Design a protein around this ligand. Structure first.
Ligand SMILES: Cc1cc2nc3c(=O)[nH]c(=O)nc-3n(C[C@H](O)[C@H](O)[C@H](O)COP(=O)(O)O)c2cc1C
Ligand SMILES: [Cl-]
Lengths: 140, 140
């Protein structure tokens, strides 16, 4: 598929940008953004994965408004990426085991035995990027 | 007071970051982000735009926006929640114009469709080396 090519393009775009800004909309219609660093590379599935505490303030926003945006800004590379998609909180044990890295101990002291540890998944719908003015678009 | 101070911290935070990612919500609930060059130095941000742009149509139905500023090199990530409005004031444009903007506005202030977006800031959330990267908040 050109799906493979699109997922590959997205990988090349964001692989070197460790933190993106994850934006939600809340009940009042306000938009809040949060620095987030994904776990794992994109592959096959056009899905991004992030560890979180289930009680993190962003989680209730995402629960009530699943449409989100994650942006990646790289002045180092003169590159800007807007990823629109839907996000859900999951507690999928297999995906957590797959994505866990010892480094996460700093934020999750009990590791996967933290009672409130969870994942935010982002199902990518559209990517717009600037490598300027009008973006290039990838639709998934 | 504390207010003028808060405005000063905000100034410290974004003074040396050139482009932010400007996020809006569309009529279908989806969120889209766009790189924008910030102009000028009030708890207000200003950006040049084209009045016929899609982002303007978005903000006309949903005025709440977010502007994020990120700089790994400066160890800081800033989320600015505000409301945006289209401004057509030629004096303010003159006041805010800088030569660098000719990249996206070739005829400069003689562009027939050039206008301003004013962002009234409601809340700033930031993560930086001063905060040991734990979330700090300023509210107006
Ligand atoms: C780094 C950079 C700076 C930009 N600055 C502006 C700007 O200040 N104003 C603007 O309208 N577009 C700017 N753009 C383009 C916007 O990101 C966007 O693609 C464009 O305004 C069209 O958006 P629209 O869907 O609202 O029509 C910039 C693009 C880049 C890559
Ligand atoms: Cl990736």
């Amino acid at each position: 598929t050109d799906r493979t090519q699109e997922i590959q393009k997205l990988h090349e775009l964001i692989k070197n940008i460790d933190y993106g800004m994850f934006t939600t909309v809340d009940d009042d219609g306000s938009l809040h953004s949060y620095p987030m660093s994904k776990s794992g590379d994109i592959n096959s599935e056009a899905t991004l994965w992030f560890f979180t505490y289930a009680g993190s303030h962003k989680v209730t926003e995402i629960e009530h408004h699943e449409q989100v945006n994650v942006s990646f800004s790289s002045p180092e590379q003169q590159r800007y990426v807007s990823i629109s998609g839907t996000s859900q909180l999951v507690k999928d044990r297999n995906k957590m085991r797959e994505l866990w890295k010892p480094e996460l101990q700093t934020w999750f002291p009990k590791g996967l035995d933290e009672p409130d540890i969870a994942l935010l998944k982002v199902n990518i719908n559209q990517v717009n990027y600037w490598d300027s003015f009008k973006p290039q678009t990838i639709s998934f």
